[PDB]
């Protein structure tokens, strides 16, 4: 039945029905056991697509809102703001969903360095998504929770994973985006991203047959952001 759920998740992925993909992978996470690499990646993909669609919607709607604020479009702004607020409710629910699964199921059952760093990184990510649209105290709270999670993941990563590991590099990339976009700290963002990149360059012999393309891609993404920021 675990195998049955994974197969249902893959069918949903093929069909691009990511809502159903999430439902199937939530059930697997519900079993309170260590997920395989395949299962962690399917769970990550499912939520990344479900939340990604709403974050893209929110950025579009927000750009339209900024356009009308500049034009003085008061009547449209009433509709735009209500619309944005609806999408934020969806975002909050999606984040709370995965954050509850991480807290009750995935983190407690995690028993490898890789899976622990993966789930604390995910925990940092979904608090970061909360912080993207949050205002005032809610933003401070989501940023504090994201920071704590990224620190816990970074502690385990530095002790358990080589600097070339894609989960470690992805963690560095996301944490640097966190410093830049949430904490408003380009200095800290560039330092982390450059440090992670240089540490990988120094130990390229730790690259794995399983993931070297993923590491390469992430290293390129670190370099691209650094290009943007500097």
């Amino acid at each position: 039945d675990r195998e049955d759920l994974v197969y249902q998740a893959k069918l949903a992925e093929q069909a691009e029905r990511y809502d159903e993909m999430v439902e199937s992978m939530k059930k697997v996470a519900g079993m309170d056991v260590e997920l395989t690499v395949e299962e962690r990646n399917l769970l990550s993909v499912a939520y990344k697509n479900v939340i990604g669609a709403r974050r893209a919607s929110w950025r579009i709607i927000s750009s339209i809102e900024q356009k009308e604020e500049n034009k003085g479009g008061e009547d449209k702004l009433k509709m735009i703001r209500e619309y944005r607020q609806m999408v934020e409710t969806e975002l909050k629910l999606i984040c709370c969903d995965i954050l509850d699964v991480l807290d009750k199921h995935l983190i407690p059952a995690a028993n490898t360095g890789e899976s622990k760093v993966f789930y604390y990184k995910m925990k940092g990510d979904y608090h970061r998504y909360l912080a993207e649209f949050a205002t005032g105290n809610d933003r401070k709270e989501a940023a504090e929770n994201s920071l704590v999670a990224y620190k816990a993941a970074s502690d385990i990563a530095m002790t358990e994973l080589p600097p070339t590991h894609p989960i470690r590099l992805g963690l560095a990339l996301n944490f640097s985006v966190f410093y830049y976009e949430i904490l408003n700290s380009p200095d800290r963002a560039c330092r982390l991203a450059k440090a992670a990149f240089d540490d990988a360059i120094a130990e390229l012999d730790t690259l794995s047959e399983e993931s070297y393309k993923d590491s390469t891609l992430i290293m390129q993404l670190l370099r691209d952001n650094l290009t943007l920021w500097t």
Binding site: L169, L173, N174, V177, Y180, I218, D224, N225, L228
Partner: peptide
């Protein structure tokens, strides 16, 4: 536009 991890 920043990129984050896949």
């Amino acid at each position: 536009r920043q990129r984050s991890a896949p």
